[PDB]
Amino acid sequence: NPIVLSPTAAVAAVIQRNDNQQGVWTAPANIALSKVISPVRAYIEANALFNPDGTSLNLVRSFPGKGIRIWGCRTLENTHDSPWSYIQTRRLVSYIEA
Amino acid sequence: NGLPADSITQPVNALVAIDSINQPWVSWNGRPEETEQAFLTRVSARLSHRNRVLSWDNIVTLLKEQFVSLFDVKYPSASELTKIPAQKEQQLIAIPDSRYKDNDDALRPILNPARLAEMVDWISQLSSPWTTLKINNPTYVDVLISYQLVFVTGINPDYGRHQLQQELSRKYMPWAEDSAIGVTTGNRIDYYPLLATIQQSPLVERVTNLTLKKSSQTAGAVGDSVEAADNEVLILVW
Amino acid sequence: QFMLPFEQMLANGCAELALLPKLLAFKQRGNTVYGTQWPFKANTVGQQVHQEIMPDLIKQLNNDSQINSDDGIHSQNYTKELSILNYLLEYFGTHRAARPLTLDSLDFLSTQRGYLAQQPELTYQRNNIRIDKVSALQKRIAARL
Amino acid sequence: AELDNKLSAIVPDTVFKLDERSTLDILNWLKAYAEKIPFDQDKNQFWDSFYFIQENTPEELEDIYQHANKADGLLPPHQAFVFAFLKLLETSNRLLNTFPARHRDLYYRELLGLSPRKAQADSVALGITLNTDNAEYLIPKGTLFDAG
Amino acid sequence: VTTVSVTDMLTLPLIALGAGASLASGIDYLSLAWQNDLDNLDDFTPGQTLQAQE
Amino acid sequence: DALFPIVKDDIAFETLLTQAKTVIEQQSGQLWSNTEENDPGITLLEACCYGASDLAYRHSLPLRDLLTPEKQEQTLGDGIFPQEFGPQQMLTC
Amino acid sequence: TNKILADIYGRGWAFPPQFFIGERIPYEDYSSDLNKYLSEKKIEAEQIVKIQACIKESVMCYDFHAKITSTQVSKQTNLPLNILVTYTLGDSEISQKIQGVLRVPPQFSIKDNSRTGIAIAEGTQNVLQSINILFLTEPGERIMREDYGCGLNDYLFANISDELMTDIQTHIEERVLRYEPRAEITSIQVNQRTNLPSTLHVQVTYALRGSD
Amino acid sequence: TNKILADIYGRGWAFPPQFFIGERIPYEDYSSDLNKYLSEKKIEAEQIVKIQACIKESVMCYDFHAKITSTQVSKQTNLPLNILVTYTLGDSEISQKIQGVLRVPPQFSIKDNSRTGIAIAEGTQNVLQSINILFLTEPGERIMREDYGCGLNDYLFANISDELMTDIQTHIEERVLRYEPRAEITSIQVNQRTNLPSTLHVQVTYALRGSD
């Protein structure tokens, strides 16, 4: 039977790879994953998990002909005017801070 | 059809010592390859009787397959399967094709007794040992037919009557005219189907009276059919 | 709802082909003469939309396919089954019996189906008789009538 | 069509039809099937009145389908959609109806192993006349003669 | 001969395009189904492997 | 015993779509004249055309495979035809 | 002029698909010819032709392929008149019926919900809708037409920068040229929304083929 | 998927050659048909088809060209059933026998040491083994095939340096291209062992032809 895994393992590889290729200021979303057969649940069940003015998830999704891709770049920040609403923005400033 | 007479006249390879070649007669022992429709028919018959004789249909089917001189084979009516004293001999009636008749009359073909013995011998080889099948020539019985007619205007009555005789003889005596049409084996002559047949001729306008009379019995009334015994074949006469 | 009738006729065609081993079977024939099925599975978007009308449409599908149902004998399906049996019987040089005029329709179908299903035994033992066993001659008489 | 030409060449098409339902029967099925799908419930509207407009019967639609000229490109588009779909299914129906013939051939030829009988060579009798300069001649077995 | 792996939300025409990219003459969805002995045009599951010849 | 090598060109999606567009022209040519890739009526029909092609492909499978039911039904000692229908029981007596 | 544009550019199904069913006709109410009814009511003779001209003109506007064959009056309106109109489309053998309201210049009105079928797009609306479908379709979604589509999903989540706006603009130009020959793109404007900083607004302006 | 790879990439003898002889069958113990034995033991009729399906499936995995013709039960096990299976390979006339253990869902097990013959390599293992043979063969060793081989013996006793590492890597790439078309070399790593300074470790990574 196929082994079920969390998406965070593959996302970390993408983030590390994306830094050298595109840069730390580039969002790691919209990148196809590897060795993934299918997501456990379809994208039609995640209509309540994205809030433009609140807390939201990052969806892992598949497309016909594009494979399974990451479809989000937001953090757990929920404030509308907060400057850390995106992962790449928060990581860019920490890269400047370092 | 076979090879027509006087077809071969010279050999394929020229030989100076050979003059004309005489081929007075046609070829024989020829048979075309089986067509798909005939193949299915033969196999279906084989799966039914298994090349053995038990029932009346098995006798008729196997005999007609083996012998080409047969036009139809008759077996006793259902009124004799209830006969209590049983029957020593199973009697069949063979109506041969007029082309293979051993006599002069085309309307009443008769087979040589030597031919009938061969069929009995052949059929007995595929039957139970406790059966005795006998095949005999039919007993032809004349059925006098007289009708009063109204012909289409402009047609001479004698000419119309002559043509009507030929049409009815073809219809009700199929074995006479080169056995090309499958028609009832001279069992019954129904009054009204016969009346419909007469009026279908283009020369006939209307039938005003029709009467059928057997050889010995009195003439029947309107709408009376004619039966035949298990050894009889009815023949229309005028 | 617009696409549903076209999905149904495609699903029936798929179901009709899957019914082929039973339609042409020499023995153990079934109760249906046409293939039908509900196009959608469970927990699907299509199933939820047609949730309320599914029992009625499925009832119509069963009625249009089964020879015998709760309503009784389906005349057209009855006629079709007779034609299939007659076609299969012609394999072995026989034919279907005449339709009954004063007999039971269900009983008549049993005679024809048993006649076809037991063709090898009936003709191989055409003249055999044994004690406490229905003879082949009796079966042939019943099938013909 | 081209499919029929290449199918009848390898399949002995028979009278019996596994699926004999015509376009009229299919249209009648659609009329009954669509009578149960509701368009809206405030009115008594069902989809059967959408595929068959007003006082239209399956007999009338079947006549139009068989003769495309008697509409001259003015049939409602959604009914042309149905007619187009019916044309699509005709190919699948044609392929299925070839199975009764292939089924019988498999039984007769593969299981029972029966094959059609081959033709039989005929025989003839020939009379020979020799040329006047030969007293006797020998014609060996196997000499070939021409019949045209 | 080329080999491909079936992922989620893939159709047979899409699989033929990916599989037939390397092939000299490509492949059509009907030929690809026949070579893989598919029971129907959707008779495959994610994680399965398919093959395509010339 | 399979019809696919014979009819693989008549089952294709493009061949069936050509027939469908011909009917639309003949029946409703003056009211439905845009039949390109973008017409919503065509996309619904094109999907149905693919489904029709899939149905026809199923019929072109090998004959012996289409006569085989599920494994849970297949009777022991039989085949495509039951054992008693073989040559040793149907041609003998 | 709408007929001229529709013939040049074509007619087809509207997007998204919509369906209608017209109201039922109470056939048991129309069993009286309108011409005999008007003549019986001693209405003027020249009113008959003017009345019929209004009916023909109003029906032709509703459907210009119509050919009036008969007309009848509802029995429950004996002078606001309810008329059932019967017509044939072109030289076909198909007949259809339609309700209407006549008022005595004479005025004729058509019942609002009378047509059964789909919604259609004509001329300029057809090509405008055609471009809209291209934008909303991604390649690989259309069966057996895997190339068709615009494919703007590939530019999502990219940093909003001058490179991205030019990539979007040039992508639209190439895809419309490939999949829409009846339209010509004259201007594309890409801007970032002030109230929603993460969204891009694209303004596309098109002209018809040979419109000048 | 192993069947698909084996057909595409071929199959043959395994390296190094290995030989097996299966255990002797005590033929004097199997003289009773299993189906008769199961029916005599008042087993359920539908259980029988599951019995036969399990044996067929188990033999299917053991040898997929098999075709079962007979099934017999050992007389020393009358309710753990010892079974002797008789099958024919494909449409051939060759028949073979194989022991098994049946337990009553039912499962069927095969005796461990039952195959007689050689060890075979299939699919990916065939290609991997093929490259291994190339590395271990020096040119001139093969009769009538004097060029076949890698030829890494020529680089022994050379000073460990960048020049030697480059020469070894490029030599492997050239030879594999010449003598192994079913594989594609993707990376070659040459490193010097710390614990054994005089030995070089070569890491070779390969991909199958047309795998992606």
mmCIF file of C-alpha atoms in Angstrom, chain H residues 192-199:
data_model
loop_
_atom_site.group_PDB
_atom_site.id
_atom_site.type_symbol
_atom_site.label_atom_id
_atom_site.label_comp_id
_atom_site.label_asym_id
_atom_site.label_seq_id
_atom_site.Cartn_x
_atom_site.Cartn_y
_atom_site.Cartn_z
ATOM 1 C CA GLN H 192 40.444 8.630 -2.309
ATOM 2 C CA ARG H 193 39.803 6.509 0.774
ATOM 3 C CA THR H 194 41.016 8.039 4.034
ATOM 4 C CA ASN H 195 41.718 4.764 5.848
ATOM 5 C CA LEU H 196 43.354 3.233 2.740
ATOM 6 C CA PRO H 197 45.232 6.059 0.991
ATOM 7 C CA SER H 198 46.337 3.900 -1.962
ATOM 8 C CA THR H 199 42.821 2.872 -3.066
#
